[PDB]
Ligand binder design. Sequence first.
Ligand SMILES: [Mg+2]
Ligand SMILES: [Mg+2]
Length: 172
Amino acid sequence: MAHFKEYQVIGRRLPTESVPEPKLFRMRIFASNEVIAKSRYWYFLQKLHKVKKASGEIVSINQINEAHPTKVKNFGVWVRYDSRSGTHNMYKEIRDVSRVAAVETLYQDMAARHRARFRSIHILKVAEIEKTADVKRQYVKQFLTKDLKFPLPHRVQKSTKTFSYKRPSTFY
RNA sequence: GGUUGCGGCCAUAUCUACCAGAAAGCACCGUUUCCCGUCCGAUCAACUGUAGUUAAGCUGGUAAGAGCCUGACCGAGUAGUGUAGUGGGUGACCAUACGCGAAACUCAGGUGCUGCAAUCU
Ligand SMILES: [Mg+2]
Ligand SMILES: [Mg+2]
């Protein structure tokens, strides 16, 4: 899984004599590949409608590419997750160039700060904030100030050799 | 279509309350010599369909009826459960993956169908 990928997954109940041409439900799924995306689709349709993989059918799966992969966006993400003692909703903000890597950042963030495994997370929503001043988290808001520039003090250079003859510097 | 005799399934047929029922049938209904049974022709027996009555039985209809029956992407793919992991959690327990999948509930509809023989504006 070099990264996540976003798939649109469209499926339906199996057609019957009573109801030919059912309703065609669709979701956007962040998954490492096609098989997981289809599995996640059925898992989530399990919780919304009376249907399972055996009574249903996957009409379409299509990868969804970022419209502008090279534009930095501020994403607001609503997640539902299970902690060890209950279920909680939260909203986080991630700044990056694509939805898939923003969601990838989000899973890493949920694992790091809340020990929430991919098993225990529901991506309720991902949406770009098209306007500044609608951004609310200070950790992403600090990066939107005009003419932003910071140094990177204490540069640590990687040495290929085991022994150095120079007693190095961390300048930058 | 009504009714009677014998039924099949055994409430969609049961229960409550209340209204209808032409004809025929069924019924209630008249009598106690006889065969029989009673504390008691109430029941059971016999006899006349004669004296009468649809009052009841019976049948059908009504009920935002009770019950019952059928369905529902109703609740609910919930509860539960087969399988898996060197999954989570101190534990109690829980999540996930591949499968199966209820009951209550909530609406909706319905309230006997039918076989054989005989008979009837
Ligand atoms: Mg008498
Ligand atoms: Mg094992």
